[PDB]
């Protein structure tokens, strides 16, 4: 029996369109704290954790706790309909339905059925959103995978194919590395198909945190508004 209102609806569609890109279905836990989504792609190689806390909503009226499951494709398509300055209202009554309304020149409400639900990091790097979006796209031109290498005071992503090779160095001098913290030399490789979905839509002004371990999974983290967060856990190669 909840009523949840988010300003900047196009923004809200974006976050969900990320989460839609790797998983086909998802659970939304609504609670008086906030909204949570936790989920793994079909092949259990990536894990998504979305936390959207009460503060980022203009109205947040939850009564207890329940768990919405939705067709993420049909949700993606409804949420894409929101304009940038329009208001998003999410609503749930007794009936198994999500009411989504967008308000602008006129208010439109869409009803969508509910469906059935269901680390010792060596290196930590902070990096602007553009740098990593660019490296992933650069690397895709030459290979299906990208290596991450962190020595003390210097951070490298590199990929190699048959003929061609790519490498992007950053030291603390480099303009889009905010921070690096590595205990020991750290080297790991990750598939580009997943990285592309993870970093698609990351502005110059977006601080992205990445924690990695020698041949172990990457944790990528960036914030939604101030309070909310998205974390991606990605299993590595070999």
């Amino acid at each position: 029996p909840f009523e949840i209102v988010f300003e900047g609806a196009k923004e809200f569609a974006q976050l969900i369109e990320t989460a839609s890109r790797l998983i086909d279905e998802a659970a939304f836990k609504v609670t008086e704290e906030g909204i949570s989504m936790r989920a793994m792609d079909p092949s259990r190689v990536v894990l998504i954790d979305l936390n959207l806390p009460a503060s980022i909503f203009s109205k947040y009226e939850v009564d207890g706790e329940e768990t919405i499951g939705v067709n993420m494709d049909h949700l993606k398509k409804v949420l894409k309909r929101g304009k940038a300055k329009e208001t998003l209202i999410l609503r749930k009554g007794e009936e198994n339905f999500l009411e989504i309304s967008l308000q602008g020149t006129a208010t439109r409400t869409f009803k969508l059925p509910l469906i059935d639900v269901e680390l010792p990091f060596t290196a930590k790097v902070v990096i602007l959103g553009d740098v990593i979006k660019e490296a992933v796209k650069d690397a895709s031109l030459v290979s299906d995978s990208m290596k991450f290498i962190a020595k003390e005071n210097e951070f490298t992503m590199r990929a190699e194919g048959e003929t061609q090779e790519v490498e992007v160095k950053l030291t603390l001098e480099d303009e889009g590395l905010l921070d690096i913290e590595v205990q020991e030399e750290t080297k790991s490789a990750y598939g580009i198909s997943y990285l592309s979905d993870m970093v698609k839509g990351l502005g110059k002004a977006d601080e992205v945190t990445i924690k990695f371990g020698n041949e172990m999974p990457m944790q990528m983290e960036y914030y939604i508004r101030d309070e909310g967060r998205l974390i991606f856990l990605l299993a590595p190669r070999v």
């Binding site: 793994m40 092949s43 259990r44 190689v45 990536v46 894990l47 680390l119 995978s145 598939g191 172990m216 999974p217 856990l233 299993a235 590595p236 190669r237 070999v238």
Partner: peptide, 9 residues
């Protein structure tokens, strides 16, 4: 090259 699963971590 060898893509493993998250389950083993």
């Amino acid at each position: 090259k060898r893509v493993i699963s998250l389950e083993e971590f």
